[PDB]
Amino acid sequence: MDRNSVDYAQIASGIDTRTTVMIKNIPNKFTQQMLRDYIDVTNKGTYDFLYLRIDFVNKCNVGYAFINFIEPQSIITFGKARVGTQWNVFHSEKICDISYANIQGKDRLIEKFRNSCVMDENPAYRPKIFVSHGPNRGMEEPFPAPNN
RNA sequence: UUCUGC
């Protein structure tokens, strides 16, 4: 229990309007595409930012990821379906868990990474954003250019 | 718990 614990009741009532979530304990061989597909099982079209950092030296990710949901209620959908479940049906070790992210909001996450050096590694390792509203909601958006 | 030290 800390300032980043996710409480569903206070999300539903509007007490906590944070939208960015840290996904924990990801097996290090997951790719960004696999994570996107994993989330889309229950939350397709409900988020507009996804980043799973890939350590290019190894063949592994850092074990966690950050996702910005468009509406806070979508956290309840993802959490109630995935929290406590195994990342791999053959291994009890890695269990999906969530908490609030320390950087909140699509705008802040864009500003964090648009000038970052990871934007010039392979696109498979880059943060991704998606259309937040309208008929194109959920489609991938070009990341804004560096502004520094 | 994200990083042009990270």
Would you say A73 and A46 are in contact if contact means Cβ atoms under 8 Å apart? Answer: no
The Cα A77–Cα A40 span in angstroms is: 11
Q: Is residue A147 in a domain?
A: no
Count of domains in chain A?
1
The Cα A146–Cα A112 span in angstroms is: 10
Amino acid A111 reads: E
| A9 Cβ contact list (under 8 Å, min separation 6) | none
Per-residue flag: A112 CB under 7 A of strand B: yes
The Cα A82–Cα A145 span in angstroms is: 34
* Domain ranges, residue A20: 8-141
Q: Is residue A91 in a domain?
A: yes
Q: Is residue A60 in a domain?
A: yes
CATH number at residue A60: 3.30.70.330
> Following DSSP, what letter does each residue of A79-119 receive, concatenated?
HHHHTTSEEETTEEEEE-EEEE-SS-SHHHHHHHHTTSGGG
Would you say A119 and A27 are in contact if contact means Cβ atoms under 8 Å apart? Answer: no
Measured CA to C1', the nucleotide nearest A98 is: B1
Amino acid A63 reads: G
> Following DSSP, what letter does each residue of A68-86 receive, concatenated?
EESSTHHHHHHHHHHTTSE
Q: Is residue A146 in a domain?
A: no
Per-residue flag: A22 CB under 7 A of strand B: yes
The Cα A103–Cα A107 span in angstroms is: 10
Residue in the structure block whose two tokens are 């990341």: A143
Distance A9 CA to B5 C1' (A): 41
Nearest to A107 by CA among A61, A31, A49, A44: A49
Per-residue flag: A53 CB under 7 A of strand B: yes
- The residue whose CA lies nearest the C1' of nucleotide B3 is A116
Measured CA to C1', the nucleotide nearest A49 is: B2
Strand, helix or coil at A59?
Answer: coil
Strand, helix or coil at A55?
Answer: strand
Q: Is residue A1 in a domain?
A: no
Residue A73, judged by CB atoms within 10 A of its CB (0-12, 13-18, 19+), counts as: middle
Per-residue flag: A129 CB under 7 A of strand B: no
Q: Is residue A74 in a domain?
A: yes
CB count in 10 Å sphere of residue A139: 10
